[PDB]
Design an enzyme around this catalytic site. Structure first.
Site, mmCIF file in Angstrom:
data_model
loop_
_atom_site.group_PDB
_atom_site.id
_atom_site.type_symbol
_atom_site.label_atom_id
_atom_site.label_comp_id
_atom_site.label_asym_id
_atom_site.label_seq_id
_atom_site.Cartn_x
_atom_site.Cartn_y
_atom_site.Cartn_z
ATOM 1 N N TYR A 105 10.852 -2.862 -21.712
ATOM 2 C CA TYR A 105 10.770 -4.067 -20.688
ATOM 3 C C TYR A 105 9.265 -4.781 -20.594
ATOM 4 N N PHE B 266 2.333 -8.069 -16.196
ATOM 5 C CA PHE B 266 1.498 -7.173 -15.435
ATOM 6 C C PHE B 266 1.817 -5.697 -15.960
ATOM 7 N N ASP B 267 3.031 -5.482 -16.836
ATOM 8 C CA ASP B 267 3.181 -4.295 -17.295
ATOM 9 C C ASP B 267 4.338 -4.314 -18.385
ATOM 10 N N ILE C 250 14.165 -1.298 -8.274
ATOM 11 C CA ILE C 250 14.494 -2.287 -7.506
ATOM 12 C C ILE C 250 15.771 -2.947 -7.853
ATOM 13 N N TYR D 36 9.825 -6.764 -4.534
ATOM 14 C CA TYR D 36 8.960 -6.308 -3.606
ATOM 15 C C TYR D 36 8.628 -7.255 -2.519
ATOM 16 N N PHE E 78 11.622 -10.143 -16.071
ATOM 17 C CA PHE E 78 11.486 -8.970 -16.966
ATOM 18 C C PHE E 78 12.213 -9.302 -18.239
HETATM 19 C C1 FK5 Z 1 0.145 6.903 -2.651
HETATM 20 C C2 FK5 Z 1 1.431 7.113 -2.003
HETATM 21 C C3 FK5 Z 1 1.689 7.941 -0.969
HETATM 22 C C4 FK5 Z 1 1.338 7.494 0.400
HETATM 23 C C5 FK5 Z 1 2.093 8.005 1.658
HETATM 24 C C6 FK5 Z 1 1.174 8.334 2.737
HETATM 25 C C7 FK5 Z 1 -0.408 7.555 3.009
HETATM 26 C C8 FK5 Z 1 1.780 8.956 3.954
HETATM 27 C C9 FK5 Z 1 2.251 7.754 5.147
HETATM 28 C C10 FK5 Z 1 2.677 8.325 6.260
HETATM 29 C C11 FK5 Z 1 3.709 7.599 4.227
HETATM 30 C C12 FK5 Z 1 4.911 8.429 4.967
HETATM 31 O O1 FK5 Z 1 4.870 9.578 4.306
HETATM 32 C C13 FK5 Z 1 5.500 10.646 5.313
HETATM 33 C C14 FK5 Z 1 6.038 7.517 4.929
HETATM 34 O O2 FK5 Z 1 6.337 6.526 5.646
HETATM 35 C C15 FK5 Z 1 7.821 6.195 5.823
HETATM 36 O O3 FK5 Z 1 8.359 7.194 6.411
HETATM 37 C C16 FK5 Z 1 7.651 5.203 6.912
HETATM 38 O O4 FK5 Z 1 7.849 5.349 8.048
HETATM 39 C C17 FK5 Z 1 7.188 3.692 6.679
HETATM 40 O O5 FK5 Z 1 7.937 2.720 6.161
HETATM 41 N N1 FK5 Z 1 5.721 3.387 6.768
HETATM 42 C C18 FK5 Z 1 4.684 4.353 7.145
HETATM 43 C C19 FK5 Z 1 3.926 4.051 8.184
HETATM 44 C C20 FK5 Z 1 3.456 2.506 8.053
HETATM 45 C C21 FK5 Z 1 4.514 1.567 7.511
HETATM 46 C C22 FK5 Z 1 5.371 2.065 6.552
HETATM 47 C C23 FK5 Z 1 4.670 1.616 5.097
HETATM 48 O O6 FK5 Z 1 4.121 0.484 4.794
HETATM 49 O O7 FK5 Z 1 4.531 2.897 4.371
HETATM 50 C C24 FK5 Z 1 3.687 2.466 3.238
HETATM 51 C C25 FK5 Z 1 4.706 2.300 2.022
HETATM 52 C C26 FK5 Z 1 5.762 3.109 1.662
HETATM 53 C C27 FK5 Z 1 4.555 0.956 1.341
HETATM 54 C C28 FK5 Z 1 5.292 0.602 0.240
HETATM 55 C C29 FK5 Z 1 4.156 0.359 -0.736
HETATM 56 C C30 FK5 Z 1 4.918 -0.194 -2.269
HETATM 57 C C31 FK5 Z 1 5.240 -1.517 -1.652
HETATM 58 O O8 FK5 Z 1 5.682 -2.105 -2.974
HETATM 59 C C32 FK5 Z 1 6.244 -1.308 -0.902
HETATM 60 O O9 FK5 Z 1 6.804 -2.963 -0.336
HETATM 61 C C33 FK5 Z 1 8.145 -2.766 -0.253
HETATM 62 C C34 FK5 Z 1 5.845 -0.804 0.652
HETATM 63 C C35 FK5 Z 1 2.792 3.913 2.708
HETATM 64 C C36 FK5 Z 1 1.885 4.040 4.087
HETATM 65 C C37 FK5 Z 1 2.196 3.631 1.684
HETATM 66 O O10 FK5 Z 1 1.153 2.633 1.471
HETATM 67 C C38 FK5 Z 1 1.105 4.801 0.946
HETATM 68 C C39 FK5 Z 1 1.952 5.894 0.409
HETATM 69 O O11 FK5 Z 1 3.280 5.799 0.074
HETATM 70 C C40 FK5 Z 1 8.233 5.561 4.559
HETATM 71 C C41 FK5 Z 1 9.843 4.945 4.806
HETATM 72 C C42 FK5 Z 1 7.914 6.498 3.467
HETATM 73 C C43 FK5 Z 1 6.659 6.742 3.384
HETATM 74 O O12 FK5 Z 1 6.362 7.849 2.327
HETATM 75 C C44 FK5 Z 1 6.118 7.310 1.036
HETATM 76 C C1 FK5 Z 2 7.392 8.725 -8.220
HETATM 77 C C2 FK5 Z 2 6.456 7.789 -8.392
HETATM 78 C C3 FK5 Z 2 6.124 7.102 -9.853
HETATM 79 C C4 FK5 Z 2 7.189 6.524 -10.587
HETATM 80 C C5 FK5 Z 2 6.570 5.926 -11.770
HETATM 81 C C6 FK5 Z 2 7.325 5.700 -12.884
HETATM 82 C C7 FK5 Z 2 8.577 6.624 -13.160
HETATM 83 C C8 FK5 Z 2 6.894 5.117 -14.092
HETATM 84 C C9 FK5 Z 2 7.504 3.583 -14.373
HETATM 85 C C10 FK5 Z 2 7.244 3.262 -15.587
HETATM 86 C C11 FK5 Z 2 7.055 2.574 -13.071
HETATM 87 C C12 FK5 Z 2 5.773 1.593 -13.843
HETATM 88 O O1 FK5 Z 2 4.517 2.431 -13.987
HETATM 89 C C13 FK5 Z 2 3.633 2.191 -15.262
HETATM 90 C C14 FK5 Z 2 5.485 0.657 -12.887
HETATM 91 O O2 FK5 Z 2 6.359 -0.680 -13.158
HETATM 92 C C15 FK5 Z 2 6.263 -1.670 -12.683
HETATM 93 O O3 FK5 Z 2 5.005 -2.107 -13.111
HETATM 94 C C16 FK5 Z 2 7.322 -2.571 -13.078
HETATM 95 O O4 FK5 Z 2 7.333 -3.416 -14.048
HETATM 96 C C17 FK5 Z 2 8.365 -2.723 -12.237
HETATM 97 O O5 FK5 Z 2 8.540 -3.489 -11.194
HETATM 98 N N1 FK5 Z 2 9.787 -1.646 -12.616
HETATM 99 C C18 FK5 Z 2 9.413 -0.803 -13.514
HETATM 100 C C19 FK5 Z 2 10.521 -0.692 -14.622
HETATM 101 C C20 FK5 Z 2 11.767 -0.798 -13.559
HETATM 102 C C21 FK5 Z 2 11.828 -2.027 -12.417
HETATM 103 C C22 FK5 Z 2 10.740 -1.676 -11.416
HETATM 104 C C23 FK5 Z 2 10.935 -0.764 -10.768
HETATM 105 O O6 FK5 Z 2 12.221 -0.496 -9.989
HETATM 106 O O7 FK5 Z 2 10.282 0.270 -10.577
HETATM 107 C C24 FK5 Z 2 10.205 1.278 -9.798
HETATM 108 C C25 FK5 Z 2 9.559 1.018 -8.291
HETATM 109 C C26 FK5 Z 2 8.211 0.793 -8.220
HETATM 110 C C27 FK5 Z 2 10.646 1.139 -7.302
HETATM 111 C C28 FK5 Z 2 10.157 0.804 -6.027
HETATM 112 C C29 FK5 Z 2 10.314 2.256 -5.367
HETATM 113 C C30 FK5 Z 2 10.228 2.289 -3.757
HETATM 114 C C31 FK5 Z 2 11.034 1.271 -3.219
HETATM 115 O O8 FK5 Z 2 11.039 1.316 -1.651
HETATM 116 C C32 FK5 Z 2 10.729 -0.026 -3.624
HETATM 117 O O9 FK5 Z 2 11.589 -1.223 -2.991
HETATM 118 C C33 FK5 Z 2 10.956 -2.199 -3.036
HETATM 119 C C34 FK5 Z 2 10.773 -0.038 -5.244
HETATM 120 C C35 FK5 Z 2 9.631 2.761 -10.319
HETATM 121 C C36 FK5 Z 2 10.515 2.922 -11.659
HETATM 122 C C37 FK5 Z 2 9.880 3.862 -9.412
HETATM 123 O O10 FK5 Z 2 11.323 4.035 -9.275
HETATM 124 C C38 FK5 Z 2 9.341 5.202 -9.804
HETATM 125 C C39 FK5 Z 2 7.769 5.420 -9.694
HETATM 126 O O11 FK5 Z 2 7.257 4.560 -8.818
HETATM 127 C C40 FK5 Z 2 5.893 -1.660 -11.066
HETATM 128 C C41 FK5 Z 2 5.470 -3.118 -10.323
HETATM 129 C C42 FK5 Z 2 4.964 -0.426 -10.296
HETATM 130 C C43 FK5 Z 2 5.439 0.921 -11.253
HETATM 131 O O12 FK5 Z 2 4.387 1.992 -11.020
HETATM 132 C C44 FK5 Z 2 4.715 2.680 -9.790
#
Ligand code: FK5
Ligand code: FK5
EC number: 5.2.1.8
Lengths: 107, 107
Positions: free
Chosen positions: A26, A36-37, A56, A82, A99
């Site tokens: 992809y 972006f990737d 996603i 996202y 994509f």
């Molecule tokens: C570096 C990796 C680990 C790093 C983990 C920590 C610092 C520990 C911190 C206590 C997270 C908790 O771990 C016990 C746990 O908190 C939940 O239980 C929760 O209550 C929650 O919803 N919170 C936490 C409190 C702030 C609001 C929200 C959030 O914003 O959380 C953020 C979140 C998930 C944002 C995603 C980021 C990707 C965007 O694409 C997406 O946009 C859709 C939103 C957290 C703070 C991330 O910034 C940083 C991390 O993930 C999530 C249900 C799952 C999450 O564990 C992962």
């Molecule tokens: C365990 C941790 C690392 C683990 C990383 C890998 C296996 C390597 C894999 C090639 C990821 C890429 O790393 C180079 C990179 O792919 C992006 O560049 C991208 O093109 C993207 O969008 N993809 C990837 C191809 C599938 C669709 C989508 C996705 O679904 O990706 C998923 C994603 C981010 C889902 C979040 C999950 C939390 C939900 O709450 C949220 O719901 C809003 C959606 C990826 C596959 C996660 O399942 C698993 C991971 O994160 C993201 C912009 C950022 C992401 O790096 C993190």
């Protein structure tokens, strides 16, 4: 939701089933085409399974409509990606994602 | 978006600025009150910064409307949280989230 536009046709018969492993190539881009990737860049296909919150929603629903060997452009609305948050330091809030995906095989 | 309902009032004067560190206690629940996480359980406040994609948008916009010491319930729509995807093995697709948050200090 997700819109699927075909670039190259698949076999028209082998569609991904929940629980099967999809192997794809992809490239992810913003709506203006900025990349972006890409797994193509890494020389390694990306593998994932349907029905396990592994990707996603836009992908979960888009890939399910592709057949083996098909190459398609998936346009995904922010809620199916996202949303208002985006993905830290890569995708801004409220972004529709494009994509180019190729379904290589099912395993 | 996000709705903020106050449980206990803050100072009414010290609101979080982008770039400041917010220290909070939170409990996250589904709309039916089922708890999925809490920093209170861990005995350790959660710290984050505004304006850096460090938290879901619902928090970024909800916390910004709270003053130091305030305790509030943030109700967040799915697009301002995990949208159609949810968060693997914890939050389902299209879930509105409820967080009880206490703003302890700004640093
Ligand atoms: C570096 C990796 C680990 C790093 C983990 C920590 C610092 C520990 C911190 C206590 C997270 C908790 O771990 C016990 C746990 O908190 C939940 O239980 C929760 O209550 C929650 O919803 N919170 C936490 C409190 C702030 C609001 C929200 C959030 O914003 O959380 C953020 C979140 C998930 C944002 C995603 C980021 C990707 C965007 O694409 C997406 O946009 C859709 C939103 C957290 C703070 C991330 O910034 C940083 C991390 O993930 C999530 C249900 C799952 C999450 O564990 C992962
Ligand atoms: C365990 C941790 C690392 C683990 C990383 C890998 C296996 C390597 C894999 C090639 C990821 C890429 O790393 C180079 C990179 O792919 C992006 O560049 C991208 O093109 C993207 O969008 N993809 C990837 C191809 C599938 C669709 C989508 C996705 O679904 O990706 C998923 C994603 C981010 C889902 C979040 C999950 C939390 C939900 O709450 C949220 O719901 C809003 C959606 C990826 C596959 C996660 O399942 C698993 C991971 O994160 C993201 C912009 C950022 C992401 O790096 C993190």
């Amino acid at each position: 939701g997700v819109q699927v536009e075909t670039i190259s046709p698949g076999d028209g018969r082998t569609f991904p089933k929940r629980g099967q492993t999809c192997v794809v190539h992809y490239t992810g881009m913003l709506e203006d085409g900025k990349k972006f990737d890409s797994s193509r860049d890494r020389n390694k296909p990306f593998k994932f399974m349907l029905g396990k919150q592994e990707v996603i929603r836009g992908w979960e629903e888009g890939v399910a409509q592709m057949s083996v060997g098909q190459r398609a452009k998936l346009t995904i609305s922010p809620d199916y990606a996202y949303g208002a948050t985006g993905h830290p330091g890569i995708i801004p809030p409220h972004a529709t994602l494009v994509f180019d995906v190729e379904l290589l095989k099912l395993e």
